[PDB]
């Protein structure tokens, strides 16, 4: 009802929202203790399915589940772990100088191996680490976590201005200037429509991983042909690359920004006021 | 009508020179490998 | 590069059963187009359509026009395959420049257990636009096109220079190379000047079966001995996958075996290139389906005429004729036909096929001009153009000026080349009538020329000064005692704005699908000519004419 | 609603102001999200591309990259439109006008189709503001998916002639009765070609390795034909399935990948999505509060969200 709260209790083995900002684009870790099984399934047999059986098992080595399940994945944890992967180096790698000095690359180095291992046996990282929200409160303990980081529509980025009279809260960073892909340089007035695309390269760049947000005034039917155009990573043949879901609407193109100040100087984009339509994924081609 | 044909056959015979000259580009070539590494065996 | 590759996807056609074929990569350079009559500026303005058809030498029909591909790139066209250009790294391979032209591979008619037929011509056509003025025609026989073997021996020096230039690029640039490129360099230094692509043509080395060249070396280095007593190519992929960032199947065969053979053109003394890769399903590839070519007709009719010293094989001995016919049975055409419409055993047999049509129409013109102008004529007029009072004294000259023109029109009709005659209106109006005894080529004919007989189609010659043609386009003017003129519906030519016979210094000359033509003079003074009473074109002669000059409309 | 307005820009033909009154509940394709916008991008002159007007397959591609909007309230100054793509958050269920010869159902998904009917052109003309208006025809979605397959295949017959001139027209439709004839006037090629290629390229990926084992059971299909009712009615007479009847190809690597289960996945990925990649997305659903089971031609049906 244009105001909501959500809560999930996890570890600070992941994100450590005390080390994060007020605004972070958190993922969950849905199906967290999963993927020894789907490592074996869904893949052609020339993939040697005994890889992800150890790969995530080295992740939780860096992080026993207990009663606090592994979840609440940060936005930072994918950018820096794919910083060596995608076509941005020493600028996407500044996100690694953000994590290891505030969060830890010990958990990144096990997971950057997963980013070559999950995509190896066709266990693609879409529909795992589902969207959760914008890190409203961080009522976490010392080594444990209790976060309210509301899902559920536009209210996450409305309930940002009301709590603090001075300046603005959250205000939804992009966490890398390489991220927030400036699509539609053919510029005009309107509202922004935000999406979460994982662009792949399968056996060319040896199972590439990518996390960035697009910028478009485009419908979901005007986004799939926009997903066929503008890419140079078509050179594959397996298949089902470039999944995407809706991060929702920023109902203003006027409030985007260009900064390099956060929390290590990391480039960052302020985005004020967002209808967080949670959307749905699609991956076929 | 003859003068076009009598030219086009002549242009063919002008081209058949370097069709054959580049085909005769092995006559000082096909002899070195069949003589030179055989005489130091005799040595 | 890819125009050689995408035509192989049309060679991947296969499916429904038909006479089995091949494919030859042929690189025409700049002056072989320029001496042909191809404007190099207009094709420089990369995928481009080429209409191709193939023609036998002795007898028979032709192929319909096949839509093909092209890649016209002004560069070192030999050196661009050999030293390609990464967008980030154009100095990956510095080279020596050369001439350049269009990249077009061309298919080959064969047999079951293919014995290719020399003297038989595949005809190219470059279409700048629709018009016949935007068209040229090229001639290529298989004697011109097919070498017996290629020269992949020149590919041996090239590939290890590639590994040294991956050893050269990282050492110059240093730490600016990324993590996948700083590995694959030194993995090519543990495996052992510019690259001139023209030396791969001019160094005398080619292909050999080499089984005779192993026994000639095994019995050579045993004399010697009796007296005495992952590869580098896989590191080339990461050499490209780090410097480019992708696979690029265009560049994938620049790493494999490349033969670059020089040949020559029998029409204008020119040179061109015969290319075969390793992984090409085309001819000379090392992944190719049998049947392949056989150089047997190029050795039978030669040596039976060379050992017998028979200079022309119609002077071949009667047993020496039929014994070749007992060997190769497709030669009954060029040896035992009474009047073949294509001339047997000549180089310009396709050219002499054309020049007859240039002749036979001029007599159909020249004895028809005499027909309507037998004696003193009465022509009175056919159009409606009114005079001013002193304007009649201009026609006082046209009385005196008149008879020198009709020589010089026919002199200019002689004076054109027949290759330049087929772009004019009379050479296509007959094709609109020989298709009526089928849509002729370049589609210069409008949609409404085939409706009435009142749709004529003009050419325009200069009356005064020199008697010269003043058009590119056949200008089709619909004509209604009297009848006033009317145009049709619709890069800038001067004379194309007026009605026929409307003004001075213009001779107007129109023709029909009925092939009853007009000769329109300024002032309405015009008259029909029954050239249909003088066109003597035999249909079996004309049926090889139309099929080379018609287009099957969809 | 997240209110969006379109003003009355310049002048009024005095009966044509009443023509905007009887368009309440129709759909405007405005290619933006604005707080105010001119009426110039609204009409079909904006639907016309550079030099040429789209065909009824190109208008599908023209209705692809624009945004539908619902006429909510009609002022003499403005027209308030609600942005369907975002502002469908209506528990008041903002109302639409059915302009279609079919009496629908209750509970149909409703997708929008360009006017292609023989007698429901929806042509209203403004001469003070020189504009032409084609309203889309809201229809039920299986009947909508029965139309778009016809019009592309009719343009598939625009590529190849070959056959004699008596072709099956693809111009007789069937809903419980109700013989419908549509318009076949012009077929632009690029609207056919790009629609044909995605019909080709998706049907490529929808075949996989384990798909091939299913092809063996094609003679098994006709064994059920002469021994039941359901199968024999399922097997169409104008089908290639009755025509093709007149094998593992072992290649077995590993055999623990579930090859038959993996076949039905990627087939559903692309051949399962063939109505929505060719046509517009359905987001309108029939929902009447009074218990009325059907909605008459010309009525004002209440409209709820995505199906």
mmCIF file of N, CA and C in Angstrom, chain C residues 68-123:
data_model
loop_
_atom_site.group_PDB
_atom_site.id
_atom_site.type_symbol
_atom_site.label_atom_id
_atom_site.label_comp_id
_atom_site.label_asym_id
_atom_site.label_seq_id
_atom_site.Cartn_x
_atom_site.Cartn_y
_atom_site.Cartn_z
ATOM 1 N N UNK C 68 24.795 -13.045 -56.521
ATOM 2 C CA UNK C 68 25.954 -13.415 -55.724
ATOM 3 C C UNK C 68 26.355 -12.251 -54.822
ATOM 4 N N UNK C 69 27.502 -12.401 -54.169
ATOM 5 C CA UNK C 69 28.018 -11.422 -53.225
ATOM 6 C C UNK C 69 29.312 -10.810 -53.742
ATOM 7 N N UNK C 70 29.776 -9.786 -53.030
ATOM 8 C CA UNK C 70 31.016 -9.110 -53.371
ATOM 9 C C UNK C 70 31.574 -8.429 -52.131
ATOM 10 N N UNK C 71 32.872 -8.147 -52.170
ATOM 11 C CA UNK C 71 33.496 -7.288 -51.168
ATOM 12 C C UNK C 71 34.553 -6.455 -51.870
ATOM 13 N N UNK C 72 34.187 -5.248 -52.287
ATOM 14 C CA UNK C 72 35.120 -4.361 -52.966
ATOM 15 C C UNK C 72 35.811 -3.467 -51.947
ATOM 16 N N UNK C 73 37.061 -3.784 -51.645
ATOM 17 C CA UNK C 73 37.798 -3.064 -50.612
ATOM 18 C C UNK C 73 39.095 -2.503 -51.191
ATOM 19 N N UNK C 74 39.241 -1.186 -51.254
ATOM 20 C CA UNK C 74 40.521 -0.617 -51.696
ATOM 21 C C UNK C 74 41.597 -0.733 -50.626
ATOM 22 N N UNK C 75 42.533 -1.652 -50.854
ATOM 23 C CA UNK C 75 43.570 -2.004 -49.894
ATOM 24 C C UNK C 75 44.647 -2.811 -50.602
ATOM 25 N N UNK C 76 45.555 -3.403 -49.837
ATOM 26 C CA UNK C 76 46.303 -4.542 -50.341
ATOM 27 C C UNK C 76 45.465 -5.804 -50.176
ATOM 28 N N UNK C 77 44.733 -6.152 -51.241
ATOM 29 C CA UNK C 77 43.720 -7.203 -51.187
ATOM 30 C C UNK C 77 44.342 -8.571 -50.950
ATOM 31 N N UNK C 78 45.584 -8.749 -51.391
ATOM 32 C CA UNK C 78 46.347 -9.918 -50.987
ATOM 33 C C UNK C 78 46.852 -9.744 -49.560
ATOM 34 N N UNK C 79 47.286 -8.533 -49.202
ATOM 35 C CA UNK C 79 47.850 -8.306 -47.885
ATOM 36 C C UNK C 79 46.830 -8.183 -46.775
ATOM 37 N N UNK C 80 45.564 -7.921 -47.110
ATOM 38 C CA UNK C 80 44.550 -7.776 -46.068
ATOM 39 C C UNK C 80 44.137 -9.121 -45.487
ATOM 40 N N UNK C 81 44.122 -10.170 -46.311
ATOM 41 C CA UNK C 81 43.905 -11.518 -45.799
ATOM 42 C C UNK C 81 45.093 -11.954 -44.951
ATOM 43 N N UNK C 82 46.298 -11.592 -45.394
ATOM 44 C CA UNK C 82 47.536 -12.065 -44.787
ATOM 45 C C UNK C 82 47.863 -11.274 -43.526
ATOM 46 N N UNK C 83 47.686 -9.954 -43.568
ATOM 47 C CA UNK C 83 47.898 -9.097 -42.403
ATOM 48 C C UNK C 83 46.608 -8.353 -42.086
ATOM 49 N N UNK C 84 45.673 -8.987 -41.382
ATOM 50 C CA UNK C 84 44.406 -8.322 -41.072
ATOM 51 C C UNK C 84 44.570 -7.278 -39.978
ATOM 52 N N UNK C 85 43.499 -6.515 -39.774
ATOM 53 C CA UNK C 85 43.514 -5.313 -38.947
ATOM 54 C C UNK C 85 42.539 -5.493 -37.789
ATOM 55 N N UNK C 86 43.082 -5.638 -36.587
ATOM 56 C CA UNK C 86 42.305 -5.518 -35.345
ATOM 57 C C UNK C 86 41.967 -4.045 -35.127
ATOM 58 N N UNK C 87 40.743 -3.699 -34.688
ATOM 59 C CA UNK C 87 40.424 -2.275 -34.458
ATOM 60 C C UNK C 87 41.279 -1.622 -33.389
ATOM 61 N N UNK C 88 41.568 -2.326 -32.298
ATOM 62 C CA UNK C 88 42.467 -1.773 -31.294
ATOM 63 C C UNK C 88 43.919 -1.883 -31.739
ATOM 64 N N UNK C 89 44.254 -2.934 -32.488
ATOM 65 C CA UNK C 89 45.645 -3.220 -32.823
ATOM 66 C C UNK C 89 45.830 -3.316 -34.334
ATOM 67 N N UNK C 90 45.849 -2.202 -35.073
ATOM 68 C CA UNK C 90 46.100 -2.303 -36.517
ATOM 69 C C UNK C 90 47.543 -2.606 -36.864
ATOM 70 N N UNK C 91 48.479 -2.380 -35.942
ATOM 71 C CA UNK C 91 49.883 -2.722 -36.136
ATOM 72 C C UNK C 91 50.229 -4.084 -35.541
ATOM 73 N N UNK C 92 49.269 -5.012 -35.542
ATOM 74 C CA UNK C 92 49.543 -6.395 -35.169
ATOM 75 C C UNK C 92 50.455 -7.050 -36.201
ATOM 76 N N UNK C 93 50.301 -6.671 -37.471
ATOM 77 C CA UNK C 93 51.134 -7.166 -38.564
ATOM 78 C C UNK C 93 51.406 -6.056 -39.573
ATOM 79 N N UNK C 94 52.511 -5.323 -39.448
ATOM 80 C CA UNK C 94 52.871 -4.351 -40.488
ATOM 81 C C UNK C 94 53.360 -5.056 -41.743
ATOM 82 N N UNK C 95 52.976 -4.514 -42.895
ATOM 83 C CA UNK C 95 53.106 -5.228 -44.155
ATOM 84 C C UNK C 95 53.569 -4.283 -45.255
ATOM 85 N N UNK C 96 53.582 -4.808 -46.477
ATOM 86 C CA UNK C 96 53.906 -4.046 -47.680
ATOM 87 C C UNK C 96 52.611 -3.878 -48.469
ATOM 88 N N UNK C 97 52.269 -2.670 -48.915
ATOM 89 C CA UNK C 97 50.981 -2.469 -49.594
ATOM 90 C C UNK C 97 50.967 -3.021 -51.013
ATOM 91 N N UNK C 98 49.768 -3.032 -51.603
ATOM 92 C CA UNK C 98 49.519 -3.623 -52.914
ATOM 93 C C UNK C 98 48.250 -3.024 -53.505
ATOM 94 N N UNK C 99 47.862 -3.543 -54.669
ATOM 95 C CA UNK C 99 46.617 -3.163 -55.315
ATOM 96 C C UNK C 99 45.443 -3.906 -54.682
ATOM 97 N N UNK C 100 44.237 -3.490 -55.052
ATOM 98 C CA UNK C 100 43.046 -4.057 -54.456
ATOM 99 C C UNK C 100 41.841 -4.079 -55.369
ATOM 100 N N UNK C 101 40.821 -4.858 -54.999
ATOM 101 C CA UNK C 101 39.576 -4.892 -55.735
ATOM 102 C C UNK C 101 38.506 -5.696 -55.016
ATOM 103 N N UNK C 102 37.601 -6.243 -55.818
ATOM 104 C CA UNK C 102 36.441 -6.959 -55.316
ATOM 105 C C UNK C 102 36.783 -8.400 -54.944
ATOM 106 N N UNK C 103 36.201 -8.851 -53.835
ATOM 107 C CA UNK C 103 36.320 -10.227 -53.363
ATOM 108 C C UNK C 103 35.071 -10.990 -53.775
ATOM 109 N N UNK C 104 35.188 -11.824 -54.811
ATOM 110 C CA UNK C 104 34.067 -12.622 -55.301
ATOM 111 C C UNK C 104 34.563 -14.033 -55.599
ATOM 112 N N UNK C 105 34.005 -15.028 -54.915
ATOM 113 C CA UNK C 105 34.211 -16.414 -55.310
ATOM 114 C C UNK C 105 33.133 -16.835 -56.302
ATOM 115 N N UNK C 106 33.498 -17.708 -57.242
ATOM 116 C CA UNK C 106 32.623 -18.042 -58.358
ATOM 117 C C UNK C 106 32.459 -19.549 -58.513
ATOM 118 N N UNK C 107 31.242 -20.039 -58.741
ATOM 119 C CA UNK C 107 31.022 -21.485 -58.846
ATOM 120 C C UNK C 107 31.455 -22.043 -60.192
ATOM 121 N N UNK C 108 31.566 -23.372 -60.241
ATOM 122 C CA UNK C 108 32.182 -24.091 -61.355
ATOM 123 C C UNK C 108 31.263 -25.225 -61.793
ATOM 124 N N UNK C 109 30.922 -25.252 -63.080
ATOM 125 C CA UNK C 109 30.206 -26.381 -63.659
ATOM 126 C C UNK C 109 31.147 -27.574 -63.822
ATOM 127 N N UNK C 110 30.704 -28.744 -63.370
ATOM 128 C CA UNK C 110 31.495 -29.966 -63.401
ATOM 129 C C UNK C 110 30.678 -31.108 -64.000
ATOM 130 N N UNK C 111 31.196 -32.324 -63.841
ATOM 131 C CA UNK C 111 30.502 -33.551 -64.210
ATOM 132 C C UNK C 111 30.413 -34.468 -62.994
ATOM 133 N N UNK C 112 29.683 -35.570 -63.156
ATOM 134 C CA UNK C 112 29.877 -36.711 -62.274
ATOM 135 C C UNK C 112 31.258 -37.283 -62.545
ATOM 136 N N UNK C 113 32.092 -37.321 -61.502
ATOM 137 C CA UNK C 113 33.554 -37.404 -61.618
ATOM 138 C C UNK C 113 34.056 -36.286 -62.538
ATOM 139 N N UNK C 114 33.937 -35.071 -61.998
ATOM 140 C CA UNK C 114 34.097 -33.817 -62.712
ATOM 141 C C UNK C 114 35.309 -33.610 -63.597
ATOM 142 N N UNK C 115 35.056 -33.489 -64.895
ATOM 143 C CA UNK C 115 36.055 -33.065 -65.867
ATOM 144 C C UNK C 115 35.582 -31.710 -66.376
ATOM 145 N N UNK C 116 36.251 -30.637 -65.949
ATOM 146 C CA UNK C 116 35.802 -29.290 -66.285
ATOM 147 C C UNK C 116 36.023 -29.007 -67.760
ATOM 148 N N UNK C 117 35.148 -28.184 -68.314
ATOM 149 C CA UNK C 117 35.179 -27.894 -69.735
ATOM 150 C C UNK C 117 35.823 -26.532 -69.959
ATOM 151 N N UNK C 118 37.050 -26.463 -70.480
ATOM 152 C CA UNK C 118 37.650 -25.161 -70.796
ATOM 153 C C UNK C 118 36.966 -24.517 -71.993
ATOM 154 N N UNK C 119 37.347 -23.253 -72.232
ATOM 155 C CA UNK C 119 36.772 -22.318 -73.218
ATOM 156 C C UNK C 119 35.336 -21.898 -72.878
ATOM 157 N N UNK C 120 34.728 -22.488 -71.850
ATOM 158 C CA UNK C 120 33.347 -22.257 -71.466
ATOM 159 C C UNK C 120 33.313 -21.217 -70.351
ATOM 160 N N UNK C 121 32.412 -20.246 -70.486
ATOM 161 C CA UNK C 121 32.582 -18.937 -69.864
ATOM 162 C C UNK C 121 31.513 -18.713 -68.805
ATOM 163 N N UNK C 122 31.942 -18.297 -67.616
ATOM 164 C CA UNK C 122 31.058 -17.721 -66.613
ATOM 165 C C UNK C 122 31.095 -16.203 -66.749
ATOM 166 N N UNK C 123 29.917 -15.583 -66.821
ATOM 167 C CA UNK C 123 29.793 -14.161 -67.108
ATOM 168 C C UNK C 123 29.388 -13.396 -65.855
#
